[PDB]
Amino acid sequence: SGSMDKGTLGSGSKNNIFYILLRDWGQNEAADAMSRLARLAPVYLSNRGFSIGIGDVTPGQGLLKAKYELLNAGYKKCDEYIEALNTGKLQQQPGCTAE
């Protein structure tokens, strides 16, 4: 079960399959497994095809709508805070000044 990723095949931290192989069955088995992976993954990747295009990063209509709403809300809240600080008294957080 599960899909391989950096957490299991990467050089991040423990729990790596190659690390377990090295610590259980010696160095030669781990080296052979790494060689087999390096020789197999490229062939399958090239036979399947993996590319990136402008359509893979272009935004959607709902995404643009949500971004617009969030920007409007943020600008409104920032203007409210600026007004409260300039004209009036603003809630000062502990350990820091109003600015």
**What are the residues binding another protein (CB under 8 A)?**
14, 20, 23-24, 31, 34-35, 38-39, 41-43, 45-46, 49-53, 94-95
Q: What is the DSSP string of 43-76?
A: HHHHHH-----GGGT---HHHHHHHHHHHHHHHH
- The Cα 76–Cα 69 span in angstroms is 11
Compare residues 53 and 59 and give the one whose CB is closer to another protein: 53
Read off the amino acid at residue 13.
Answer: S
CB of 44 to another protein, least distance (A): 10
**CA gap 67, 70 in Å, rounded:** 5
Smallest distance from another protein to CB 64, Å: 18
Specify the residue, 45 or 66, whose C-beta has the smaller distance to another protein.
45
In the complex with another protein, which residue's Cβ is closer, 61 or 91? 91
